[PDB]
Amino acid sequence: EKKEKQIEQQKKIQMSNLMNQARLKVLRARDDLITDLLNEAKQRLSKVVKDTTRYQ
Amino acid sequence: QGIQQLLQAEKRAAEKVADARKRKARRLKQAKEEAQMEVDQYRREREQEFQSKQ
């Protein structure tokens, strides 16, 4: 009951740590989808700076 | 004669309480060690439940 209950707890920590890293990977994947959207917006505002009549 | 043969007849019964005690010398010690040999049931159970870990 020490050999069995410890490995059942340690597996259940291991399973719960797997869903934590799976949730944090897809949440961090949602960062770069917004980060490049802000990055390409920074590029497309520079094209407004290039032409003069809309920029002034 | 009478009295000397009677005390030697007692030594048959006087050695019978030694046969009483040797039957509680041997039986006490011999079955303690097969009550020590039941740890082999724990040796086979641990490696069989090691497969449950495996």
Short description:
The structure is cut from a larger assembly and holds chains A (56 residues) and B (54 residues). Chain A is mostly helical. Chain A contains one helix and no strands.
List keywords for this structure.
part of a larger assembly, 2 chains, A: 56 residues, mainly alpha, rod-shaped, B: 54 residues, 81% helix
What oligomeric state do the depicted chains represent? part of a larger assembly
**Which outline of chain B best applies?**
rod-shaped
State the end-to-end CA separation of chain A: 78 Å
Biggest interface, chains and residue tallies = A-B, 3 and 3 residues
* Strand-residue proportion of chain B: under 5%
Q: Helix coverage percent of residues of chain A? A: over 70%
Helical proportion of chain B, percent range: over 70%
Number of strands of chain B: 0
What is the tally of beta strands of chain A?
0
Number of H/I helices of chain B = 4
The termini of chain B sit apart by: 81 Å
Tell me the structural class of chain B.
Answer: mainly alpha
SSE string of chain B? HHHH
Radius of gyration of chain A from CA coordinates: 24 Å
What percentage of amino acids of chain A are in beta strands?
under 5%
Protein name (chain A): V-type proton ATPase subunit E 1
Organism (chain A): Bos taurus
Family (chain A): Belongs to the V-ATPase E subunit family.
Subcellular location (chain A): Apical cell membrane; Cytoplasmic vesicle, Secretory vesicle, Synaptic vesicle membrane; Cytoplasmic vesicle, Clathrin-coated vesicle membrane
Task: Describe the fold and architecture.
This is part of a larger assembly, with chains A (56 residues) and B (54 residues). Chain A has 56 residues and is mostly helical. Chain A is 86% helix and 0% strand. Chain A is built from one helix and no strands. Chain A has one helix spanning 3-50. Chain A starts with a helix and ends in a 6-residue tail after the last helix. Chain B is mainly α. Chain B is built from four helices and no strands. Chains A and B meet through helix 1 of A and helix 4 of B. It is classed as proton transport. The entry lists the keywords proton transport. Cryo-EM structure of V-ATPase from bovine brain, state 1. Chain A: V-type proton ATPase subunit E 1. The organism of A is Bos taurus. Chain B is V-type proton ATPase subunit G.
